[model samples]
Target: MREYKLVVLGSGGVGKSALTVQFVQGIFVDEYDPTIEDSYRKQVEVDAQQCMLEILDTAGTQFTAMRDLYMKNGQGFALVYSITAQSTFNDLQDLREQILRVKDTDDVPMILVGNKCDLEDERVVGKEQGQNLARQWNNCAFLESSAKSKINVNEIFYDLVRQINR
Candidate 1:
């Protein structure tokens, strides 16, 4: 099997673990805290293509120490969060900076996911804003997803595969 490694980085309580579990297991836990710093590996069929995806759902705020590990082993990244938290959305720049600092290669693909998009009532960042931000950074794309409702959840991973394939 062709295995791929991914690292999800963002602030705490930004839905990183929830999004990971939703994408990998097709299930989302409402109150899943990232108490355990762990990894989850799984196999799946995406876009009619079968492959293994090893996701390292690391702690959100500690990528400085783990940046080398993630950037070296990671094939791609999904910077995640909810639209309700504008502060988390604003942190993407710092995360991007960290990614570039540690990664020593061209075409290190990335996808920005505004998780918890189902909370339209509390949405602050518009879809256009996320898409524009992603486009501003070369070779990156934006997706809005909701782990609770599974909205666009699978597409987030699938889109990352497409981004890498390109």
Candidate 2:
């Protein structure tokens, strides 16, 4: 069951969905092609929003349990944080720790995302913070994304998918 199980991990209001939806809802102009319905990457359209999401359903659990469940199931994770609020940025440390603990491996497929980069003037956390943290942590990949500006949203998934495939 090598479905592309992906997750967006971050504190609420980091606008995580904005990026995920952008990735899932890609190619939205009557681009429906069922020919690619080959097994493996089964496609499920999530409404008028079109395209697909690499999500693992963690039903029948409380928040902590639900959160833990996904880390076990997820093949790749998007660790996003708000660039303007250092508190939001600080939250990912424990989440990443939780994920490494859950996976029992330091080489888990991971990506560090700093969302809401449109507020460049309001930024409290420097770009180097995410960059260097990534270097010391999993050392996978790092970048800042902005849903408002639609920068690097789709590339995130491609990178995540390639990491999973590799």
Candidate 3:
């Protein structure tokens, strides 16, 4: 079995916990709590091999203060942003750069995630825009997942693991 440590990063209210919980428990949450950080571990099968994932669901507001510490321990990252909030999408660049600076490499494994895709009417960031940003970030995988609707939620995590191993 293989093990990986992943940190979920984003601004407040961008559904970071929602996505993490959905993937770990197969449920959706409507209420938002600004908890500092929570860790989850799940055993899963990837490419016919067993693996363990240690995920950190972090508070957006306090993330900056702990970003350096988190980045140092993380083997991979799921960099989340809300599709309805342009500022959230814009926030990823700094996070990405910080990860690179901490890791001291451009080949860091990360997924640029656009969450809250179920709220289509409220969306301010388009799918194309997310892809473009992913491209700008050196072709890191980009995905739009609706944690409420359970869309592409698992795929994001699974794909990220693949990226880490690759």
Candidate 4:
């Protein structure tokens, strides 16, 4: 089976851990403890092909110093942002740029994830905004997900793996 490594990243409280936990464990958590780094593994079929997935869920912070370090050896990335926070969405630009810099390539396998779609009333970043941003970045795969509701959580990870394989 093929193996893929993915790193999930975002600013604090943006549901990065929430999405990771939901996808890896099939559980939604209302309360999230701060994490430095957590790893999960799973074997699944994507397009009827078996593969092992290694997912690294990183802590959310304003700090960017360790991004390059965490991004190392990563085959794919899931850059998450809260739809309720425009700042989180804005933060992705910097994070995405950093990934390219660290990887020394513009073609890194990646996807933009707008999390917390369940909080529709508190949304500050519109779905169109996320789509526009993803399109602006050369049409990267983008999805709006709700970890609390188990919406598109699996699809986001699977899409990233497909991108890596492509």
Question: Which candidate number maximizes TM-score?
Answer: 3
Off by over 4 Å in 4: 62-66
- Mind giving the per-residue lDDT tens digits that candidate 2 earns over 65-119? 6676678888888888889989888888888888889899888888899988888
Which candidate leads in lDDT?
Answer: 3
Ranking by lDDT: 3, 4, 1, 2
Local lDDT at 101 for model 4: 90
RMSD of each candidate relative to the true structure: 1.8, 8.6, 1.1, 1.4
Candidate 4 TM-score to native: 0.95
51-117 per-residue lDDT for model 4 (tens digits): 8999888877544555667787889999999998888888899889988898898899999999999
Q: What is residue 45's positional error in candidate 1, in angstroms? A: 2.0
Candidate 1, lDDT over the whole model: 0.79
Model 4 poorest ten-residue lDDT run: 61-70
* Pairs of residues at least 3 apart in sequence or in different chains that clash in candidate 1: none
Query: What's the TM-score of every candidate structure?
Result: 0.90, 0.78, 0.96, 0.95
What order do you get sorting by TM-score, best first? 3, 4, 1, 2
lDDT of 2 at 136: 82
Winner of 1 and 2 under lDDT: 1
CA lDDT, every model vs. true structure = 0.79, 0.70, 0.89, 0.88
